Write a protein that binds this ligand. Structure first.
Ligand code: PIT
Ligand code: ZN
Lengths: 4, 260
């Protein structure tokens, strides 16, 4: 889920 | 309403014992690394995978500039090393890729390098891992490091745009509810998922920002136990150290680590  | 001295008394009194820290570019400009010629179409291309596959040299130039030996940690980093040595540091979340948290002697187990690290590298094709020393010679020698099995480009484990944050980022699920003090130094945490993380500590938890200005979710969605120490981050850190009675330990630590 969490991306840069 | 809480002041810097109240936060200091909370820490001195050990009523604050599990400090979660979040840091960004503002703690590293005093080491001489700026925020934000390189042969780049625009700034962000240095951390995009398609550009990188097409021209890896500008990234490798930055890597050479950031490898150990170019910069040293400053009072900011050493203040954080001190929290660790005094048994107060639950986790340190950094957006920096300069590695100075680990250089300041904070152990890896205490760090979430949310934008990754030069300490290790990964073949971009077959996904084989390599210690970052293994490509060091090539980067220092302006050669593109190549996988000794598939010939793929071997890239340091810097997180690029659109990549998942590192696996250790998951620790936020446990650290943030466990935090009894949130310290934000040298970043506004403007962008997701860092923004919402400031919102993930319990309502009873002081949030202390040492930063140029009051910006980000501390400005946008304040809580009653928030503190802003605005201005020079180094000056703010020093005021806090000074209220904690850690002046002599700062000096001891800094000279042990850096000569003087
Ligand atoms: O400046 C850039 C350059 C680039 O090449 C990609 C991105 C973002 C990519 C991305 C962001 C979020 C996602 O969820 C995803 O699948 C991909 C940003
Ligand atoms: Zn490979």
């Amino acid at each position: 889920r969490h991306k840069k | 309403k809480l002041s810097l001295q109240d936060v200091a008394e909370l820490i001195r009194a050990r009523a604050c014992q599990r400090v979660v820290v979040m840091v960004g570019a503002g703690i590293s400009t005093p080491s001489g690394i700026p925020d934000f010629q390189y042969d780049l179409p625009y700034p962000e291309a240095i951390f995009e995978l398609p550009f990188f596959f097409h021209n890896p040299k500008p990234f490798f130039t930055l890597a050479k500039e950031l490898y150990p030996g170019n910069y040293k940690p400053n009072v900011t980093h050493y203040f954080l090393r001190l929290l660790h040595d005094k048994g107060l540091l639950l986790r340190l979340y950094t957006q920096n890729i300069d590695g100075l948290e680990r250089v300041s002697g904070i152990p890896a187990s205490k760090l979430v390098e949310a934008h990754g690290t030069f300490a290790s590298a990964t073949c971009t094709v077959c996904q084989r891992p390599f210690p970052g020393e293994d490509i060091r010679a090539d980067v220092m020698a302006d050669r593109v490091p190549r996988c000794p099995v598939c010939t793929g480009v071997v890239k340091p484990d810097i997180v690029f745009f659109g990549e998942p944050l590192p696996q250790r980022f998951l620790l936020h699920v446990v650290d943030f509810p466990m935090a009894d003090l949130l310290l934000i130094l040298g970043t506004s945490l403007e962008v997701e998922p860092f923004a919402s993380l400031t919102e993930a500590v319990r309502s009873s938890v002081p949030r202390l920002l040492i930063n140029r200005d009051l910006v980000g979710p501390l400005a946008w969605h304040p809580r009653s136990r928030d503190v802003a120490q605005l201005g020079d981050v180094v000056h703010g850190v020093e005021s806090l150290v000074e209220l904690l009675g850690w002046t002599e330990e700062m000096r001891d630590l800094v000279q042990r680590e850096t000569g003087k």
